[PDB]
Design a protein around this ligand. Structure first.
Ligand SMILES: CCCCCCCCCCCCCCCCCC(=O)OC[C@H](COP(=O)([O-])OCC[N+](C)(C)C)OC(=O)CCCCCCCCCCCCCCCCC
Ligand SMILES: CCCCCCCCCCCCCCCCCC(=O)OC[C@H](COP(=O)(O)OCCN)OC(=O)CCCCCCCCCCCCCCCCC
Ligand SMILES: Nc1nc2c(ncn2[C@H]2C[C@H](O)[C@@H](COP(=O)(O)OP(=O)(O)OP(=O)(O)O)O2)c(=O)[nH]1
Lengths: 368, 57
């Protein structure tokens, strides 16, 4: 990793960027277009983790604009509840049954003890897992490194944090652990992890300084929930990720400086871990052949429906994650008769689409 | 004929007229099968069933 200040300009790509959002990458595309020809020192996956009030979007934005990488924002549940046409599905809440209504993080902030919350965290995992592969498709196909505000490796910390406060049952822990044991072994671990360290009182101070209308007057962010998550980070997630990823603890109780952490990143030698073949650090990115590199690119640019179909675990013993059949029927009749999702995206003529009589272009990795 | 000759049973005299559907049944049944297969493809992908009529043609 080399910054823009020492390099004296923007980085140059070693090859042309592959249009991974338009063209598929099968083995017959992998014969011609190689994938290790566009890799350099700025092809790392950096996850900037921290507490909930630490500045991570601004820091990840300036790190992406400083190290010449792409900033991937934090996931929020507007990605499900707003479709591709821009229609909000929170306006279908009176039509939906109350056991199948909308549950965003605002509804968690006022009502954390609701039965949908055990669904909600799982939904958050289904947006982190869907983002990281979308991060990995940017690493393997274009060569540009990515930086993520949140990672699916760190999402279990919030799961035990809602468990310890009492918002989750033991069955919700069991089904999230089954989903994690089913899914977390299929995606590559990041190269570098930045933990922006904050004490428990300064998190509350930044929360009341932000003055977001659902963070204030909420009983979720007490002195036990924040302390539980900051303890649980540093003694479960950091200890798990330090075996593979480099771990950088930064005292973010002040405003925080950007040039010192770019200096701290730049002195890290990334080639010393490739000397040992069986080294635990950077084991997931150690591909000795071009065929293994192309197999790794195929696994995320072409086999993303497989990794999204790996969320198909049946666990019916929990009552708060089973949608009843009449409620599921009226949920289908409301949700799939919406103006946005009557058909697949790009083929809905009710919301201003033309030329459908001669259109047979499905798309790549599109949710149906 | 008063004999049950085996050779004249297989010999085509030419008095059997083919039906109206006999020369034309298989192309129109396979055309309807192809149109229904394209409609089935468009239904399985949640496309409109008559979207992309070039595939049907
Ligand atoms: C043997 C059958 C011979 C039938 C000869 C006449 C066929 C006429 C077909 C076109 C008109 C159909 C009427 C209509 O409005 O269709 C719109 C309907 C509905 O169109 P739609 O636009 O409402 O689509 C429904 C929405 N999705 C795609 C999300 C499900 O489309 C069809 O009927 C298309 C299928 C044609 C089926 C023809 C009959 C055979 C079925 C055999 C089943 C066993
Ligand atoms: C034999 C057994 C039946 C096989 C076909 C079953 C069709 C069932 C049916 O009537 O489906 C109606 C259905 C209505 O639409 P629906 O799927 O409810 O939309 C939900 C949108 N989210 O779906 C539709 O109206 C669209 C799909 C229609 C499929 C038609 C297939 C036509 C086949 C024609 C050739 C038949 C063989 C000829 C040889
Ligand atoms: N239940 C639950 N809540 C979550 C989860 N992830 C985040 N949250 C909630 C807790 C907090 O209210 C808030 C966390 O804030 P963020 O991590 O998005 O940081 P914030 O945007 O405040 O600052 P930043 O963008 O990092 O500068 O969202 C999760 O997985 N589950």
């Amino acid at each position: 990793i080399s910054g823009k200040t020492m390099r004296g300009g923007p980085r140059v790509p070693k090859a042309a960027p592959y249009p991974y959002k338009t063209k598929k990458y099968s083995v017959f595309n992998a014969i011609f277009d190689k994938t290790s020809k566009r890799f350099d020192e700025n092809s790392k996956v950096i996850c900037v983790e921290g507490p909930i009030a630490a500045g991570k979007s601004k820091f990840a934005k300036e790190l992406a604009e400083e190290l010449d990488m792409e900033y991937y924002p934090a996931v929020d549940l507007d990605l499900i509840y707003i479709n591709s046409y821009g229609y909000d599905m929170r306006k279908l809440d009176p039509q939906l049954p109350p056991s199948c209504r909308s549950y965003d993080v605002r509804n968690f902030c006022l009502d954390p003890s609701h039965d949908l919350a055990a669904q909600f965290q799982i939904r958050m995992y289904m947006l982190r897992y869907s983002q990281y592969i979308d991060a990995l498709q940017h690493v393997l196909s274009t060569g540009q490194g990515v930086v993520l505000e949140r990672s699916p490796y760190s999402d279990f910390v919030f799961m035990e944090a809602m468990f310890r406060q009492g918002y989750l049952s033991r069955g919700a822990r069991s089904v999230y652990n089954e989903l994690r044991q089913n899914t977390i072994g299929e995606l590559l671990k990041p190269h570098l992890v930045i933990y922006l360290d904050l004490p428990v009182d300064a998190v509350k101070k930044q929360i009341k300084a932000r003055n977001v209308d659902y963070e204030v007057q909420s009983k979720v962010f007490s002195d036990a929930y924040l302390s539980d998550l900051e303890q649980l980070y540093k003694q479960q997630y950091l200890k798990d990720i330090s075996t593979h990823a480099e771990l950088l603890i930064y005292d973010w109780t002040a405003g925080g400086e950007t040039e010192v952490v770019v200096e701290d990143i730049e002195r890290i030698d990334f080639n010393q871990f490739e000397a040992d073949i069986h080294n635990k650090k950077m084991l997931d990115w150690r591909f000795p052949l071009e065929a293994e590199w192309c197999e790794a690119r195929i696994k995320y640019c072409h086999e993303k429906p497989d990794l999204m179909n790996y969320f198909n675990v049946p666990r019916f013993d929990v009552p708060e994650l089973v949608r009843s059949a009449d409620d599921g029927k009226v949920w289908r009749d409301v949700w799939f008769n919406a103006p946005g999702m009557k058909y697949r995206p790009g083929y809905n003529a009710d919301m201003g689409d033309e030329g459908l009589l001669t259109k047979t272009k499905i798309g790549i990795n599109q949710g149906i | 004929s008063a004999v049950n000759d085996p050779l004249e049973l297989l010999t085509n005299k030419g008095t059997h007229e083919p039906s109206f559907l006999s020369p034309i049944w298989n192309p129109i049944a396979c055309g309807v099968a192809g149109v229904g297969a394209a409609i089935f493809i468009n239904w399985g992908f949640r496309k409109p069933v008559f979207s992309g009529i070039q595939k049907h043609i």
